[PDB]
Amino acid sequence: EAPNQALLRILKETEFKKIKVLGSGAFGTVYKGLWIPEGEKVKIPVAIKELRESPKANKEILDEAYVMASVDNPHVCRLLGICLTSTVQLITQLMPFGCLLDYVREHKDNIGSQYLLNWCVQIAKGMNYLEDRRLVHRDLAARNVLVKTPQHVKITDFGLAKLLGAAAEYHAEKVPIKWMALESILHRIYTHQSDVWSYGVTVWELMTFGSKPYDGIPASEISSILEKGERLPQPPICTIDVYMIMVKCWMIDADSRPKFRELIIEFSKMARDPQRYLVIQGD
Ligand SMILES: */C=C\C(=O)Nc1cc(Nc2nccc(-c3cn(C)c4ccccc34)n2)c(OC)cc1N(C)CCN(C)C
Numbered sequence: 001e002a003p004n005q006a007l008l009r010i011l012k013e014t015e016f017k018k019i020k021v022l023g024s025g026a027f028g029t030v031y032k033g034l035w036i037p038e039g040e041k042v043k044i045p046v047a048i049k050e051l052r053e054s055p056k057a058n059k060e061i062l063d064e065a066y067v068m069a070s071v072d073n074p075h076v077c078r079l080l081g082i083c084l085t086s087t088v089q090l091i092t093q094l095m096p097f098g099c100l101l102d103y104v105r106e107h108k109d110n111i112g113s114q115y116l117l118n119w120c121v122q123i124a125k126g127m128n129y130l131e132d133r134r135l136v137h138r139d140l141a142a143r144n145v146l147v148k149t150p151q152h153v154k155i156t157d158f159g160l161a162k163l164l165g166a167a168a169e170y171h172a173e174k175v176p177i178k179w180m181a182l183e184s185i186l187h188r189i190y191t192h193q194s195d196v197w198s199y200g201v202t203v204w205e206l207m208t209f210g211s212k213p214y215d216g217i218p219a220s221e222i223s224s225i226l227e228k229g230e231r232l233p234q235p236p237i238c239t240i241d242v243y244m245i246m247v248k249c250w251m252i253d254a255d256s257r258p259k260f261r262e263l264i265i266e267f268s269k270m271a272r273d274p275q276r277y278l279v280i281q282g283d
């Protein structure tokens, strides 16, 4: 390994400021923000995630965070800094174009085949990087893929599930059922191959330009629906070559699903001749 490595920074409250709210949740709030490293003159657009609030827990939280800061891939968000002063705050680089989910909804008219296929490649490369690290994301969704540029997206919120662990309120009180693999839903089994299921859902969200999955069906019904063998419909732009890939991700047998390495090859091949695999008007 190289001498220089990515390192988590512990930040002071003075260092960064919240400018506006980007998103909200039971977890907390995410803010558009500015970071200035201590004793430095540079201002860095950040996103600050502040959890609803621990001190004993702080040591546990720190261990989770260190991993999140070790992630070193172009397609995975890296946790830059943490602050534990009153409540946990997580600092990452700001992604100016927001998430893909909102992106494909806004720009539905104007998105070409090459862009969509390319995003599919980048998400798979990032997931593959995590799998090599033996890290399981557990929450892959279009909402959690962010746009640095039309040509650069990154998977966010890796490892957040564990952190939300440090907790009891968290358990005594939710999971993204619609995105989840069946094993995850029934036994809370999380693997790279349950991440591959969610990858397929994420691709479906992109290919339909942001449609909510299983919109009629309620979440509770979903397990029954899957066992019955129903699956998300083929998106209209998708050719069967693309859909069969999605279908493979959603197979009940985990080992049967495609590996991330395979997905990169497959979507790379499609990206090379985009019009062949996606039929969009104005392409
Ligand atoms: C899918 C919603 C979304 O992310 N919208 C969004 C995001 C950003 N920038 C940004 N950068 C880094 C990290 C995040 C981020 C991480 N997590 C877990 C978030 C949850 C909720 C919101 C943002 C999160 N976000 C952004 O920067 C310009 C703008 C933006 N949008 C789309 C504007 C707000 N609309 C949702 C109204």
Ligand SMILES: [Cl-]
Pocket (backbone or CB within 6 Å): none
């Ligand atoms: Cl939504």
